[PDB]
């Protein structure tokens, strides 16, 4: 598309906004930028020629724009943007700008959880095939930074926020992994359903009806699931295989990923790669080489028959449910739950907490809430380190120590990554 002579305003000076700045500069267009923060750190990176307004949105600039490029996020709800729409001013996001300029097929992935694992893994399948692939979007580099005439395939992770502002995506294959929001619930689902519009192939979760396109399944749909679907899992005394269209394709022992959820992520990835035309042999190869992302049901230690699992990326009840459903534990599960639950209903976790082989170690702001799930088997401490010092002397060969806390880490940590890193350090110290 041609932006010459347009009055362009970018909202947001994070890396995504800066990518949009670079995008217009490269096309001879000097956009205006604004950010509600007083000193966003992107400031220091702007060219001198770019007019900037910070500390709030500038209504006059928005109302004078020919195009508003909105960084994705709660900012999309700001009443000044809504006023700009009412005046007929075009509003788009970086993903729309990208789709207009992309000169290679797009694989598009959204979902409440599993999206980064799946996006990365489809990336690795393309790399295994020798395909010049650009991987990013809502994870890694923002999408505009991936644009390159040499690119043969793009694999994008997309948020609901990004999809709200995207009208030009025609993915070669797209998925909603699952659906577990500023604009309300219907809006959240509706936004994800945008990903299927003009997608050649839709990869749906057989286990989550909300991932099905609006009007139902259609001829474009390929499913992945635990017990059934085009891509599913098959389990026979001691062994689990990925199964595709009726055929086992890989024993999971050949994969580095562990856990039912990552296996379904592997299936969804395979299905997207198969739909994108990637060769099957190299995509299987990638399944055997891919280590997994840190903090995503990641095995950080396995000594003396005890596996220590960092699932710190589980910051909500849906993520933890996904970690708990189909969990395989020979001996006792030692489950660490805690942090800032953000007023969540934890009860869905309770289904998974019966039997004689579960111990709970609860901590952080809402530790009390979490222990109340089954007080009989719960301890409560202030910190995860304290909880880990309680369980460590109790573990026995056969056990699993799982950090899947169902809460945000911000009461005690900088982010879920620091929480997982500390968990790994302590596991190594104690285990
Ligand atoms: Ni050892």
């Amino acid at each position: 598309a041609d932006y010459q002579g347009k009055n362009v305003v970018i909202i947001g000076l994070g890396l995504t906004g800066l990518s949009c700045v670079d995008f217009f500069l490269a096309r001879g267009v000097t956009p205006r930028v604004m950010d509600t923060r007083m000193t966003p750190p992107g400031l220091d990176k702007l060219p001198e020629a770019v007019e900037r307004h910070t500390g709030s949105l500038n209504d006059e600039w928005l109302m004078a724009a020919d195009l508003i490029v909105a960084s994705p996020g709660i900012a999309l709800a700001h009443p000044s943007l809504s006023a700009a729409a009412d005046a007929g001013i075009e509003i788009v996001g970086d993903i729309e700008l990208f789709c207009r300029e992309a000169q290679a097929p797009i694989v598009a992935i959204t979902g409440s959880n599993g999206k980064s694992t799946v996006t990365t893994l489809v990336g690795e399948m393309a790399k295994a095939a020798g395909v010049n692939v650009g991987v990013g979007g809502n994870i890694g580099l923002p999408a505009l930074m991936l644009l390159d005439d040499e690119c043969e395939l793009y694999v994008l992770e997309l948020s609901s926020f990004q999809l709200e502002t995207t009208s030009s995506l025609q993915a070669v294959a797209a998925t909603i992994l699952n659906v577990t929001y500023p604009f309300g619930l219907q809006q959240y689902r509706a936004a994800k359903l945008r990903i299927y519009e003009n997608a050649k192939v839709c990869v749906v979760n057989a286990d989550d009806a909300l991932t099905m396109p609006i009007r139902g399944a259609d001829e474009r749909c390929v499913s992945f699931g635990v017990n059934m679907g085009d891509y599913h899992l098959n389990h026979q005394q001691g062994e689990t295989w990925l199964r595709v269209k009726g055929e086992k394709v890989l024993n999971v022992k050949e994969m580095k990923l562990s856990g039912q959820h990552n296996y379904t992520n592997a299936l969804a990835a395979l299905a997207l790669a198969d739909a994108a035309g990637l060769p099957r042999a190299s995509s299987l190869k990638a399944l055997t080489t891919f280590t997994g992302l840190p903090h995503r049901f990641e095995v950080v230690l396995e000594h003396n028959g005890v596996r220590w699992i960092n699932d710190s990326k589980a910051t909500n009840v849906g993520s933890t449910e996904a970690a708990l459903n189909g969990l395989h534990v020979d001996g006792t599960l030692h489950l660490l739950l805690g942090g800032d639950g953000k007023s969540a209903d934890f009860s869905p976790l309770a289904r998974y907490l019966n039997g004689d082989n579960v111990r709970l170690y609860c901590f952080g702001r809402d530790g009390a809430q979490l222990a109340a799930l089954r007080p009989e088997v719960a301890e409560q401490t202030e910190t995860m380190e304290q909880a880990m010092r309680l369980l460590a002397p109790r573990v026995q060969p056969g056990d699993m120590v799982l950090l899947s806390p169902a809460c945000a880490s911000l009461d005690q940590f900088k982010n879920f990554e620091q929480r997982g890193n500390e968990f790994a350090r302590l596991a190594k110290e104690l285990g």
Side-chain angles (χ1 to χ4, degrees):
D2 181 4
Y3 304 101
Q4 295 162 322
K6 301 277 199 58
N7 184 317
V8 176
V9 171
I10 294 162
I11 304 173
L13 286 168
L15 187 59
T16 294
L18 289 170
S19 81
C20 294
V21 171
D22 172 86
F23 175 85
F24 292 108
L25 295 182
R27 284 160 181 74
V29 169
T30 305
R32 286 177 163 174
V33 307
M34 65 183 59
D35 192 300
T36 50
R37 297 168 291 172
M38 194 56 70
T39 309
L43 265 180
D44 292 335
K45 290 149 192 120
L46 292 172
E48 161 83 302
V50 173
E51 303 180 55
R52 69 291 305 275
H53 170 97
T54 64
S56 59
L57 298 189
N58 188 313
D59 286 347
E60 174 190 7
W61 284 16
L62 290 173
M63 300 300 292
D66 295 309
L67 179 67
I68 301 175
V69 182
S71 294
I74 341 170
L76 285 184
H78 190 303
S80 284
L81 252 205
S82 186
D86 282 2
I89 300 180
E90 187 178 14
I91 295 158
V92 305
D94 68 312
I95 297 305
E96 173 60 18
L97 291 184
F98 174 91
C99 291
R100 292 165 181 199
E101 307 309 326
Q103 313 301 340
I106 304 164
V107 176
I109 299 124
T110 192
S112 297
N113 58 69
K115 59 187 178 285
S116 296
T117 289
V118 173
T119 292
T120 301
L121 175 48
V122 179
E124 296 294 312
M125 304 172 161
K127 292 174 190 193
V131 167
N132 198 333
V133 59
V135 191
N138 189 65
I139 182 88
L141 298 187
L144 298 170
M145 286 178 78
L146 301 175
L147 275 175
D148 180 347
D149 277 346
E150 302 273 39
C151 190
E152 304 172 296
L153 186 62
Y154 294 101
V155 181
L156 303 176
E157 179 189 313
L158 304 181
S159 70
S160 272
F161 288 139
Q162 285 169 319
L163 281 163
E164 291 282 4
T165 56
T166 303
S167 41
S168 295
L169 174 61
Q170 315 178 249
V172 58
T175 182
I176 301 166
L177 292 173
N178 42 63
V179 181
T180 63
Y181 190 55
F183 277 115
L185 167 59
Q186 294 304 349
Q187 189 46 85
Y188 183 72
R189 195 205 173 204
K192 290 200 183 305
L193 288 168
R194 305 177 56 91
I195 206 171
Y196 295 140
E197 286 297 313
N198 305 125
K200 291 181 162 153
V201 172
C202 303
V203 173
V204 300
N205 189 345
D207 294 323
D208 189 336
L210 303 190
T211 71
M212 301 284 153
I214 326 190
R215 308 284 200 252
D218 63 45
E219 60 158 299
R220 293 170 310 153
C221 295
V222 170
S223 68
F224 70 94
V226 173
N227 293 331
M228 311 171 51
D230 293 294
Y231 293 67
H232 66 261
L233 304 176
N234 171 255
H235 185 70
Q236 282 281 326
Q237 41 166 333
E239 309 227 72
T240 302
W241 301 265
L242 305 186
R243 188 146 174 277
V244 180
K245 289 193 180 299
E247 307 296 335
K248 293 171 183 183
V249 295
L250 185 77
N251 188 309
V252 307
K253 291 192 195 184
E254 302 275 356
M255 301 165 69
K256 294 180 175 192
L257 290 181
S258 296
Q260 173 183 283
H261 186 208
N262 288 343
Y263 299 153
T264 72
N265 286 335
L267 298 172
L270 193 52
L272 294 164
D274 284 340
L278 289 177
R280 159 76 62 77
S282 44
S283 298
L284 296 181
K285 172 70 183 181
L287 291 168
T288 76
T289 62
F290 178 60
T291 58
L293 294 170
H295 317 299
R296 274 67 165 187
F297 202 85
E298 169 193 17
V299 173
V300 293
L301 193 167
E302 177 163 10
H303 187 43
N304 294 329
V306 182
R307 178 177 301 153
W308 301 70
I309 303 190
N310 170 14
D311 193 37
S312 185
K313 174 60 187 196
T315 50
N316 49 62
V317 164
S319 288
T320 300
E321 278 191 63
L324 295 186
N325 192 284
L327 194 54
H328 172 241
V329 184
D330 291 339
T332 308
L333 170 57
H334 302 263
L335 179 64
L336 285 150
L337 300 172
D340 184 358
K342 298 160 280 161
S343 305
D345 174 9
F346 297 111
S347 62
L349 299 184
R351 165 201 210 96
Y352 301 105
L353 310 184
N354 303 312
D356 314 286
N357 303 304
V358 181
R359 299 311 198 278
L360 301 174
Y361 306 85
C362 302
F363 63 93
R365 194 193 184 184
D366 298 324
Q369 319 239 122
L370 287 150
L373 293 157
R374 198 182 166 186
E376 299 187 327
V377 305
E379 310 274 20
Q380 185 192 337
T381 53
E382 190 185 324
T383 71
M384 184 175 72
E385 171 166 4
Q386 289 156 357
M388 290 179 74
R389 294 187 191 271
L390 290 181
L391 63 95
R394 300 182 195 179
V395 308
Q396 295 286 343
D399 296 359
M400 174 182 296
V401 181
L402 176 61
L403 174 74
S404 190
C407 307
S409 64
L410 300 178
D411 57 316
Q412 286 172 323
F413 301 88
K414 185 188 214 190
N415 49 44
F416 73 83
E417 288 94 337
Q418 185 187 61
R419 175 178 67 194
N421 292 336
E422 188 70 355
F423 168 87
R425 185 191 69 73
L426 285 163
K428 168 182 184 178
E429 186 58 56
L430 299 171

